[PDB]
Ligand binder design. Structure first.
Ligand SMILES: [Cl-]
Ligand SMILES: [Cl-]
Ligand code: NA
Length: 312
DNA sequence: CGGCTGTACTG
DNA sequence: GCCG
């Protein structure tokens, strides 16, 4: 990580682009920043800069200004709105467009939002849990959340598999949120469970707010019982057994891992989703058999990677 | 020039 | 932003 002196300046620029909705430029910055964060030695030569994949002409030119001047002149033309747009867009359910609208309307603080903004149902929940949603949890707590869902689900059928995915499954010490993936080996007994499970978890007082209720995926808010507990983001997903491996892969991530794998599948005339690895349409396309995650890797001509190896 | 992943909610 |  011999990077700090350059990346710190780039991240400021990156975040500005992000919160103002210039997602593609922010992507380039993210990737560039990630590369610098993983190069063996500190960057010295302009040519050395280009030498790195993810860093090109313009990023090189910028890195050179940092190494020399110790300051990047672009960081001075960042709209003063940025901190407020970040503040506003950290409300779950409010993105760049909402943040900008609120800013235009003269709002500057969460007090302004609370007292004067018209909030969607999701945004009101997001504001209520503003601080909690910015907090990570120790992985031990993710374990408890998993078991809470598992115990509730297994009440309906002891054969149900319940797996917490995301950074938890990638073996991280802390987790931003928990995704519990649920299926049944017999390809059938997963049906019916979804709505009953949610209602059970709600009656138990575990689910405190619902954000999105989809057909097979729920997004909401949970809190474990007892003192000193925070509200945590929880998704619960139910999939037929045939999708298990692709869903494990997707819900495990990371984000960059997922997009890279999808990009690779596309180069090979395939398409990869949380549902299946398919032949490209580029009729509709054929679902390729993938009973395990290894199968997805092999079909893409990749050696298997354990969840901890997918933390990109 | 233009893709940069592919999915599924809300209202 | 990067890159084919
Ligand atoms: Cl542009
Ligand atoms: Cl595992
Ligand atoms: Na948000």
């Amino acid at each position: 990580n011999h990077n700090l002196h350059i990346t710190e300046k780039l991240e400021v620029l990156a975040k500005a682009y992000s919160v103002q909705g210039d997602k593609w430029r922010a992507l380039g910055y993210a990737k560039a920043i990630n590369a610098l964060k993983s190069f063996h030695k500190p960057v010295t030569s302009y040519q050395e800069a280009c030498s790195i994949p993810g860093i090109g002409k313009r990023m090189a030119e910028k890195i050179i200004e940092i190494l020399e001047s110790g300051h990047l002149r672009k960081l001075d033309h960042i709209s003063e709105s940025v901190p407020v747009l970040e503040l506003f867009s950290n409300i779950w359910g409010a993105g760049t467009k909402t943040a900008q609208m609120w800013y235009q309307q003269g709002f500057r603080s969460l007090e302004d939002i609370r007292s004067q903004a018209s909030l969607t149902t999701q945004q009101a929940i997001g504001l209520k849990h503003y601080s909690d949603f910015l907090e990570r949890m120790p992985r031990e707590e993710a374990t408890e959340i998993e078991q809470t869902v598992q115990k509730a689900a297994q009440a309906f059928n002891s054969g149900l598999l319940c797996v917490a995915c995301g950074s938890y499954r990638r073996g991280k010490a802390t987790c931003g949120d928990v995704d519990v993936l649920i299926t049944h080996p017999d390809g059938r007994s997963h049906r019916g469970i979804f709505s009953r499970l949610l209602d059970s978890l709600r009656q138990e007082g575990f689910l405190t707010d619902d954000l999105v209720k989809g057909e097979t995926k729920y997004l909401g808010v949970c809190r474990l019982p007892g003192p000193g507990r925070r509200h945590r983001r929880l998704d619960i997903i139910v999939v037929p057994y045939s999708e298990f491996a692709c869903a494990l892969l997707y819900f495990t991530g990371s984000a960059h891992f997922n997009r890279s794998m999808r990009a690779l599948a596309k180069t090979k005339g395939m398409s990869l989703s949380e549902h299946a690895l398919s032949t490209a349409v580029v009729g509709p396309g054929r679902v390729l058999p993938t009973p395990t995650e290894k199968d997805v890797f092999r079909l893409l001509g990749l050696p298997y990677r354990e969840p901890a190896e997918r933390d990109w």
